[PDB]
Amino acid sequence: VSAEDKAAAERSKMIDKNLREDGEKQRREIKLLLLGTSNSGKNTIVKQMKIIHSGGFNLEACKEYKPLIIYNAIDSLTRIIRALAALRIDFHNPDRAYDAVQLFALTGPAESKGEITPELLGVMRRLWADPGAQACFSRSSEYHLEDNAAYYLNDLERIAAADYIPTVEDILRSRDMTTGIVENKFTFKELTFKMVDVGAQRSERKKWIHCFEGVTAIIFCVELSGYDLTSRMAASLKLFDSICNNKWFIDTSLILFLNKKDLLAEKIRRIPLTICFPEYKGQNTYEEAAVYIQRQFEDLNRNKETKEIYSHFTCSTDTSNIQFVFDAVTDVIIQNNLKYIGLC
Amino acid sequence: LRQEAEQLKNQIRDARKACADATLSQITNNIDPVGRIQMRTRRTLRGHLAKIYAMHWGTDSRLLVSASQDGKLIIWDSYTTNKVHAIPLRSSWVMTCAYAPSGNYVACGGLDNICSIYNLKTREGNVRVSRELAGHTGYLSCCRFLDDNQIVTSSGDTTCALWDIETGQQTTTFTGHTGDVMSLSLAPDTRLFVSGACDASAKLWDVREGMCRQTFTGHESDINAICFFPNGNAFATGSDDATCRLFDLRADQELMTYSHDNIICGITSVSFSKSGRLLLAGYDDFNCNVWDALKADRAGVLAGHDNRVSCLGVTDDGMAVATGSWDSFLKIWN
């Protein structure tokens, strides 16, 4: 062991020291994976957990979400204008064609710096107000347009302001840019969560799911209103059955978030819930339909006594979502402790 | 068109059968078997705090990189067990790592759908991310450097890709796999490569052309592992159906099947010896198996891991085998 081998060994020892420090930091992290379906609420649950922290207007969280809302507003013009080419709809004023390139010319500059320039604001105002695009927006059924485009387009002036402060209603409707994996660190009441959202994962679960073998719990977001909104709740039931009864998540408790409960309250008044579930045979009011939907999700749960489902009707107004996750994770930790101590 | 495709499949199957004179067992039935490989753990590389998903040996046969779910990419001196570097990843969900043949770079990727290239030899003393290879819409299951500027990555989006690391662009996209592509093996001359996918197919690709030269389908389940034979005329696959297979590029066949009845776990990683006589396959049953690549019998077992052997690789000099596993340890065997 020469002098340089000694200094290489000392370097390896410092590396081990940092590795242990990092592992001790990460061991205190509680890893949860958000695992709801396509339009379920995972993104809005993570966003709502960030925002409503300590007051409904924790604005410092709202500051990081300005680029996303800008991108949604910016893409909204790009989506509506590009819809004209597929719909073969001509602009009422041909001068929009020059402005049509103008948005794409500034599209790169706006998304990269996370701001809406005044020139784009005029370009956006003119393009959106053009009747030809207005018909194009009305024909959104055949075009890939996010439902948040309508509200932002009606308030592009608020979005482009220099001191624009995103609002909770503005953020909660934004669509997080599709990213393979999404990690969110939450510290709630001395407990640090890492909500690991696997975003657009264009691959099979059976290959990447064991990467989350040792998560504390799974947060499964379900859209309650989606029972009649291509078999959205049937997709949630299939996904939940697969995830709950996964070989990797035998002892991993599931936090079941049932999202958009008020929207369900309107939809059942209009649409009967028997459409999704032909064998419902129950009342079509809320606090009956909701409990029914929980019952299906928690009845898909096989292999009880090892894992538990913590069902919650998510309230975007209050911190009952993060509080429920804290309570469920606390119960998960305490139950695990009871288990190896042998009491339960 | 579907009838024509099935007719062409039948034609390829008959053409393959026309070239199957004698099985590889019958031809190799007379060679003296290797006795029993007593590889022993010469080094245990400790320092990873989560499951190890990938390792790659350096071409100097002394350094190896490993990727773990603990978010670290560690470079080891396997002779001294010294940790040369510990690279913290932006995404801890890393499934693959590659070590550049120059040694100037490592790659890693996984659930972030990005191959990150790391500059090992920077003027500052740190390893930094030199390139983020975005463009895959699924996770990266494997990555392999062609040289300092080129790297082939397989993905769960069912496509392999050739990248220009300088520009960061997919120089070639290798489409044709229907299931998740789980592995790559560059040919020794790196003019072509094989990829195994979850559609139980192994596809021989042309790097320069960009086209699928051959498709190899003998497995019953997902192919997790693939490895070229040292002469580049054959490759071995390791699948979830608890079997390995040796395919020949020129015969376009499945020469040999490396299976045991009491082996029911899938294969996570396969590799060959320097002479290629040994196919060392890592298994879910916690222990790697040494196979006689020519006679299809287990020469030995590299038991010694407390969890699934997730990755393995034989040095370029053939001296040692490193097995990483989900028990967070790398063990050098010999």
């Epitope: 200094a7 370097r11 390896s12 | 040694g103 500052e124 003393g125 740190n126």
Partner: single-chain antibody, 232 residues
């Protein structure tokens, strides 16, 4: 990447001063740092070595106890406190970046140095040849001899070659025997075995003029050779 020494100046003998080097543009916390001095007309003489993490410190036996070497990782500053400053402590003190892992390039970057002027078992690396006369475009070979085998049993030969170009800090050329440092033109080449070493410059240019230094890194008294100058 730079190292900038501070301190120096006229010091009354028996006094005390503290040298500082501010590191910039590199991960200073991960580099073992050396102090290497050069008497105002003599060769290089290694002073001290604080490793990365400060866990290991060495001194030249000529200055042990009188100097202490310290680093400020948050400040990226390397220090040398100097006490009982004799007359033989006059030198130009170079801080040397130095990182040790497999295949690393120790002694690869050197600071500008600060001249310090004071009022009035070690491996002997011998390069007895000095002031080799040579002309541009002509191959030259500088010898170096070692009082011990620099060949370690691990396969390394811890011989270093530096280039003190006139008015310039040493430039690492060959880090371990026959290893060309990055940025060194691929005409320099190191050779040797055991104790005898040769630095062959394939086709030298006007930049190669200067003084070429041996250095063993087999042990920690780090000893140089009396540099063999090249002169046009």
């Amino acid at each position: 990447v730079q190292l900038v020494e501070s301190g120096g100046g006229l010091v009354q003998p028996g006094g005390s001063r503290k040298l500082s080097c501010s590191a910039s543009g590199f991960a200073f916390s991960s580099f073992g740092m050396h102090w290497v001095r050069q008497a105002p007309e003599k060769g290089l003489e290694w002073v001290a070595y604080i490793s990365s993490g400060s866990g290991t410190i060495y001194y030249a036996d000529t200055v042990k106890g009188r100097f202490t070497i310290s680093r400020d990782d948050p400040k990226n500053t390397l220090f040398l406190q100097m006490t009982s400053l004799r007359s033989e402590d006059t030198a130009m003190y170079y801080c040397v970046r130095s990182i040790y892992y497999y295949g690393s390039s120790p002694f690869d970057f050197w600071g500008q140095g600060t001249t310090l002027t004071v009022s009035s078992s070690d491996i002997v690396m011998t390069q007895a040849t000095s002031s080799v006369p040579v002309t541009p475009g002509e191959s030259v070979s500088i010898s170096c001899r070692s009082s011990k085998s620099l060949l370690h049993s691990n396969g390394n030969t811890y011989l270093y070659w530096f280039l003190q170009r006139p008015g310039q800090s040493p430039q690492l050329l060959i880090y371990r025997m026959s290893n060309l440092a990055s940025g060194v033109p691929d005409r320099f080449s190191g050779s040797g075995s055991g104790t005898a070493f040769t630095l062959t410059i394939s086709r030298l240019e006007a930049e190669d003029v200067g003084v070429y230094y041996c250095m063993q890194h087999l042990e920690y008294p780090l000893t140089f050779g009396a540099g063999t100058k090249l002169e046009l």
